[PDB]
Design a protein around this ligand. Structure first.
Ligand SMILES: Nc1ncnc2c1ncn2[C@@H]1O[C@H](COP(=O)(O)OP(=O)(O)O)[C@@H](O)[C@H]1O
Ligand SMILES: Nc1ncnc2c1ncn2[C@@H]1O[C@H](COP(=O)(O)OP(=O)(O)O)[C@@H](O)[C@H]1O
Ligand SMILES: Nc1ncnc2c1ncn2[C@@H]1O[C@H](COP(=O)(O)OP(=O)(O)O)[C@@H](O)[C@H]1O
Lengths: 211, 445, 442, 435
């Protein structure tokens, strides 16, 4: 790392770790290939490929959406357009187990039926014990009192790409590296902040960011 | 409007009578009387639907009409009956086994029929009034939805509001609601509000306001293949695997469950079984393991009727070291009935050439058609069929409408057969690269 | 009804403590093979031996697959049966050793019995009762939750733990929905809305299920049947968790993976522990591999290893080859295409070809199963043609004969119909003879 | 300044209005019949009615097949799609080869869409949103050097404005049709609010705020095929850093192709789209396996198949993937029945001399007469390509000795320094230890 170090009523410790390797990029490649301007067609082609000629669009392909909703059991016909145009990690994060209608083609497998029973089941039940091999193997071989044998030799942050003379590049890189949704997902909220948000501000629990 | 003229686009159905008797020239097909009668028998076996897992083989010399017979059977099968047409080279995959690829091809050719009743309320939203209780557990709603002719008011529920605040409608959007099932879609925005917001946005689209009755009744019949149910029931979100091909070796237990419960839906009376045809063109390049799996995969009740086409004589079977008739093992040939196709004569070649010129919108003279028929007797039929299309452009360049003998002769001079190319290669062998990589580049000895 | 090359065969046809009679269960002949297969059936029902192999060998069109399905029908629909082709073991996702092991474990079933005490019905009231002395700094200090249930010929009011109230809020349960309360765990779940509240609103989604039958309190004995492979694949994948890896992999392609011997050992010992308690029962079954000459010598070596297991089922192999090189080798001439190491660990059942009368009887039963009426002379011509070319070719030309008979508006198949069907559809010998005398690359 | 690479003196087939070829026109010398046949095929492509037409042009090496295919592409124009390919490119480690052939088939069928571009740019003077916790709309004021224009905006573009951190005094970019918002930077009028700042200061736009422009978009069917078959998901507008999983190619199902076909047909019937079929050219067709050759037969029978052009320089050669199939040009007999064969002839001495003079004048080199005759004699004795590749070292050797023309001594020096295949093989045969 190259970070902000000291050469020697509070102090600030701010995250400043970078990579010593720098990838330098000219402004012209950014401004004429990734950013839209008046002389290029990034946004027009994006709209044409992603909205107009999308085959899950109910404004042009209603029959396919109705066929898929009979297949899957989705209560909304705009679900497939939403799924096909969002990234995978965002789809993992905001996934909610909403109800689906019974008159559909989707089923419950016997593996899923075995899984759903033993979610909250206690010990000494036959199904629960037949479905809990790994936890019994964890608690039999004393794995919460074992020591770590390997640690890595070098730890290194991602390679820093710089573009001289562009605030847009810095904002885009800070948004990608420190995305608030995924950063909140991989952490948790403090309890007193949850109390202040739920009671003192009237935010319901279903409106909390997923953590 | 996304269809051009193909190799056999004139064939639309099998030209048979009500006694399964072929006409000499009807419905696009010329000749081949016994093969057409046998294909009509196979057509009636598929249309009866009480038979399962039967393999037929269409065997003949090249350019005889085997894939023409398959196209005629496909056109006379009618819609909502599955027809899967694969080649033999399509089943060798990098991320799928041959057995699983053959199973997917087998289960793409047999489907079930589901009929459902829809009551749609499609219109433009005027105003939504939301009333909330003190506890807030449940909410009531007012929806004022408007077509061109009629506007009314409905009472919404709590889950109606929970489904409406997702994909948020904003008083002027075209939506539709199913009364029996509760399905919701947002079609877009009306054209009457297209000059309010001055810049569209990424997620918006402008549709026309619907007219007529607000409540409309319409029935819809869906035909779903068994492979689609397999793909849907193998993952959390499996329709992307239907449209991307990343199914990845579906397990056998979900297939057994799907077979059992398709049978119980047939017993209840909600779905009906619709059998179909799987066509494997050029079956001689399949492995011996594929042949064994085909041998044991036809003995299931949910098995289609399989048609195979081969132009090979006694040739080697791939994966082995011996030679067999049609490139197929004798165990597969014992489970088969063979339709034999035979070579044409001059009159049938002339009739096929006239049909292909009529389909391609080309006007030929009598002498030009006679010369093309003579070429099609000497050479093959496809050379004359291609000569029609190039001689049409040769005639158009001369500012003439109908083609003549001169245009056919110019097309014969400019474009060669296989035989003339063989002769011209064989008499100038030193200018070509041989099996040993030898060539004489220079022109001076 | 759909018929496909079988389903005229129901069982073997043996009587009690005796020999097979001539025609019973759809079988015509093969008396010694039926007797040996019946002895194998009693050996499977004895539930004692493990890892026994039986290879039944004979020529093509003799009845090996028929005897395998007859074994499956005679065992019943609770004993597991895994039909398989030797070509199916070659997979591009995992190694063929693990495919054979998965098919091995799929043939052993478990019989588990359990008692469920459950409360269900329409909710009449749902109130959290406040305590006598509330604690400061909080709102809604609950002491118990009073929930009233209503079903057909019953109504009962319950006294619950306060910790059921968070599951009440989690499943979004109001007054009027029908719920499902199991005894030890609590853990309510909303079945749906009652049918008596179906038409309160013009537009709604909550589905409407009927009010349940019977009393609100019932103890039912459920018997759930799974195989050992289902237990393996349920234990291998991680359970319901909140980490990004599990829900990330649920939305991806379910790739097969090499399940270790460790997991199978722990599954085997917990299964034995609950079998010794009397709760469970093990039902071994049949794994049937067809055309075993397609197997490589490495899979044969793994079969040699895997037949030594304690939990192994019976395994039935079928082959039609004579003296053939084993696949994967260049010089091993072996009987039936099976290496001698496996041949020493099995018993061989011989199946003999048929005669004219047996071919005629098989054509007759395949005709009456297909719901066809055949005359006497047409049946004799079909039997003569079956003797001349193939029995399967005679069975393949029954439904074209029926279609050509229905074309002329008759319900009987006669000699000119079978002659026209013979002219329309060729057999292997006539097509080979056409191929041999033609020079147009036919 | 300018680059020359083995072509680009070829500008077209050089035909008249009757389809006849002149001797020297369009960079081609000789080869009248192949150029006339190629013009006929070009007209058949222009007619826009036929699917699955296959033409194989065959002949020895250095005879002009690739130049003829290139001239067909120049005669068709930049609107018509042209997908050049070599036969070795169909083998991939991600998908099967038949899938790759299907993508290359659908890359040769194009569409033309007429679109418009509508852009508001300028300095933000007012950004005031009004509610009814949900905003109804926002009114934005924009300023340029030619005036100010106020706009009403939907909440989605207001959320996009809030994402890009736009305040009062920033020069922004709004496109009307898509709703894209880009922040150019703060304006120079607020450049002296602090002495040192982290913001970049851009000047005002000198034009109007509102700009209108009609554009043409060219896509292919494969672009829509891969836009609708993304397995990982839809990607964001800006992504310097990659996705979490690496997306690989997948076997695109025929159902997705059917849905894309019906959407394109419904857009064609409304006058929004125009269909332009094109050419798939496969050089070195002898590299193809028999499985690809077998799949080509059923691929050419589709209703949306393009015009396929193939080239081969083999004779009676065995086919790859077989052992005992000897067939002309390395092409199996099942596909040569579906083909029309155009022959390509070897050259004479004066044709070689005219080709050398044309390659000299496109490369901006002056040659004497005697050097031209020695280069022609060398071309007839060794190879046509040898003289064309020796033209430029002769120019370098003439530039070294301060001359503007290539003299016989430069040609002799370049022949001494560089060898051909024949002399190198002669050194190879009379040698002791690996040359
Ligand atoms: N009986 C027929 N009637 C009409 N066209 C035919 C007939 N037989 C062959 N053809 C035509 O001949 C051409 C090539 O024949 P094809 O069926 O491809 O040969 P093969 O059976 O070897 O595949 C096709 O365009 C097809 O339309
Ligand atoms: N003993 C028998 N009795 C009745 N039908 C038989 C008998 N043997 C064979 N068959 C029938 O012959 C047909 C083909 O025999 P099959 O069992 O496939 O031969 P293989 O032993 O080669 O698998 C089957 O449809 C089966 O119903
Ligand atoms: N008739 C011609 N007139 C002018 N230049 C030609 C002609 N034929 C070939 N050339 C030139 O000769 C070179 C080799 O020709 P090329 O097309 O590569 O041969 P091939 O047919 O083996 O591909 C190319 O650079 C091309 O520009």
């Amino acid at each position: 790392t190259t970070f902000g170090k000291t050469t020697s009523k509070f102090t600030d410790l701010i995250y400043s770790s970078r990579n010593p390797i720098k990838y330098s990029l000219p402004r012209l490649i950014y401004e004429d290939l990734i950013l839209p301007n008046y002389n290029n067609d990034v946004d027009i082609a994006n709209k044409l490929k992603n909205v107009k000629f999308n085959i899950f669009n109910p404004s042009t392909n209603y029959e396919l959406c109705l066929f898929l909703s009979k297949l899957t059991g989705e209560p909304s016909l705009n679900e497939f357009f939403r799924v096909s145009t969002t990234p995978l990690l965002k789809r993992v994060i905001e996934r909610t187990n909403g109800p689906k209608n019974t008159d559909s083609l989707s089923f419950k497998t016997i593996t899923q039926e075995l899984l759903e029973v033993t979610r909250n089941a206690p010990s000494e039940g036959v199904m629960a014990s037949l479905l809990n091999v790994e936890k019994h193997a964890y608690e039999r071989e004393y794995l919460n009192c074992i020591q770590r044998g390997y640690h890595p030799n070098v730890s290194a942050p991602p390679v820093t790409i710089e573009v001289l003379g562009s605030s847009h590049v810095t904002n885009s890189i800070n948004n990608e590296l420190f995305d608030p949704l995924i950063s909140q997902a991989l952490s948790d909220i403090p309890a007193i902040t949850q109390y202040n948000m739920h009671v003192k501000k009237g935010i319901p629990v279903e409106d909390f960011p997923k953590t | 409007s996304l269809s051009l003229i193909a190799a056999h686009s004139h064939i639309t159905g099998l030209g048979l009578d009500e006694n399964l008797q072929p006409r000499p020239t009807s419905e696009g097909m010329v000749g081949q009387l016994q093969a057409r009668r046998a294909a009509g028998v196979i057509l009636k076996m598929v249309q009866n639907g009480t038979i399962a897992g039967r393999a037929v083989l269409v065997a003949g010399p090249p350019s005889t009409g085997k894939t023409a017979l398959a196209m005629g059977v496909s056109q006379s099968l009618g819609k909502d009956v599955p027809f899967t047409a694969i080649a033999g080279s399509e089943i060798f995959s990098l991320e799928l086994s041959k057995t699983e690829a053959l199973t997917q091809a087998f289960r793409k050719s047999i489907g079930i029929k589901i009929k459902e009743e829809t009551e749609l309320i499609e219109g433009e939203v005027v105003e939504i009034q939301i009333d909330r209780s003190i506890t807030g557990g449940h909410k009531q709603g007012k929806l004022t939805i408007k077509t061109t002719d009629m506007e009314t008011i409905y009472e919404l529920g709590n889950k109606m509001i929970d489904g409406l605040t997702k994909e948020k409608v904003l008083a002027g959007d075209v939506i539709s609601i199913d009364k029996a099932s509760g399905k919701i879609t947002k079609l877009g925005r009306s054209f009457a509000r297209s000059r309010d917001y001055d810049a569209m946005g990424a997620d918006t689209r402008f549709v026309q306001c619907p007219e007529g009755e607000l409540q409309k009744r319409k029935t819809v019949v869906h035909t779903v293949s068994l492979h689609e149910i397999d793909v849907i029931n193998s993952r959390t979100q499996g329709f992307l695997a239907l449209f991307t091909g990343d199914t990845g070796e579906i397990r056998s237990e979900v297939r057994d469950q799907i077979n059992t419960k398709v049978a119980e839906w047939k017993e209840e009376g909600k779905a009906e079984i619709v059998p179909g045809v799987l066509f494997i063109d050029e079956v001689h390049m399949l492995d011996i393991e594929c042949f064994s799996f085909i041998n044991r995969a036809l003995e299931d009740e949910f098995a289609p009727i399989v048609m195979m086409a081969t132009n090979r004589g006694v040739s080697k079977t791939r994966g082995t070291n011996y030679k067999s008739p049609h490139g197929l093992p004798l165990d597969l040939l014992d489970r088969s009935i063979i339709i034999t196709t035979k070579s044409y004569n001059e009159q049938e070649i002339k009739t096929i050439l006239s049909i292909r010129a009529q389909e391609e919108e080309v006007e030929l003279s009598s002498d030009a058609l006679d010369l093309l028929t003579k070429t099609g007797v000497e050479t093959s039929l496809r050379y004359s069929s291609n000569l029609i299309s190039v001689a049409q452009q040769i005639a158009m360049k001369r500012k003439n409408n109908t083609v003549e003998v001169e245009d056919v002769k110019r097309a014969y001079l400019l474009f060669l057969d296989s035989a003339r190319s063989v002769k011209y290669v064989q008499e100038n062998e030193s200018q070509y690269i041989d099996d040993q990589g030898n060539v004489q580049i220079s022109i001076a000895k | 009804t759909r018929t496909a090359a079988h389903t005229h065969i129901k069982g073997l046809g043996l009587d009690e403590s005796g020999v097979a009679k001539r025609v019973e269960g759809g079988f015509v002949g093969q008396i010694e093979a039926r007797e040996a297969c019946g002895v194998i059936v009693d050996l499977i029902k004895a539930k004692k031996m493990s890892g026994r192999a039986i290879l039944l060998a004979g020529g093509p069109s003799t009845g090996k697959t028929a005897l395998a399905l007859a074994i499956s029908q005679e065992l019943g629909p609770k004993v597991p049966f895994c039909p398989l082709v030797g070509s199916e073991l070659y997979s591009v996702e995992v190694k063929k050793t693990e495919t054979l092991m998965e098919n091995f474990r799929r043939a052993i079933g478990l019989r588990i019995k359990e008692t469920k005490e459950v409360y269900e019905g329409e909710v009449t009231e749902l109130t959290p009762e406040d305590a006598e002395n509330p604690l400061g700094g909080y709102g809604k200090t609950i002491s118990h939750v009073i929930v009233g249930l209503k079903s057909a010929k019953g109504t009962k009011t319950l006294r619950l733990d306060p910790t059921i109230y968070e599951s009440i809020q989690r499943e979004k349960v109001s007054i009027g929905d029908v719920i499902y309360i199991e005894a030890n765990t609590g853990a309510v779940k909303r079945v749906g809305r009652s049918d008596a509240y179906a038409t309160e609103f013009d537009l709604e989604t909550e589905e409407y299920v009927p009010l349940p039958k019977g009393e609100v309190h019932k103890k039912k004995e459920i018997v759930q049947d799974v195989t050992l492979h289902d237990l393996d694949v349920a234990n291998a994948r991680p359970q319901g968790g909140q980490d990004v890896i599990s829900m990330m992999g649920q939305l991806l392609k379910p790739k097969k993976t090499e399940i270790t011997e460790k997991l199978r050992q722990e599954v085997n010992k917990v299964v034995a522990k609950y079998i010794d308690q009397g709760v469970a029962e093990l039902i071994p079954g049949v794994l049937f591999i067809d055309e075993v000459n397609m197997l490589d010598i490495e899979i044969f070596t793994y079969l040699n290893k895997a037949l030594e297991s304690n939990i192994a089922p019976v395994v039935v192999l079928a082959s039609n080859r004579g003296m053939t090189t084993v696949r994967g080798t260049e010089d091993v001439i072996s009987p039936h295409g099976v290496p001698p190491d496996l041949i020493d660990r099995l018993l061989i059942v011989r199946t003999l070809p048929y005669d004219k009368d047996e071919i005629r009887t098989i054509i007759e039963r395949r005709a009456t199963v297909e719901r066809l009426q055949v005359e006497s002379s047409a049946l004799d011509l079909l039997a003569t043609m079956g003797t001349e070319t193939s029995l399967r070719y005679a069975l393949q030309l029954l439904a074209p004969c029926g279609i050509l008979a229905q074309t002329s508006n008759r319900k009987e198949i006669v000699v000119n119909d079978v002659n026209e069907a013979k002219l329309l559809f060729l057999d292997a010998k006539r097509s080979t003879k056409i191929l041999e005398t033609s020079a147009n690359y036919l």
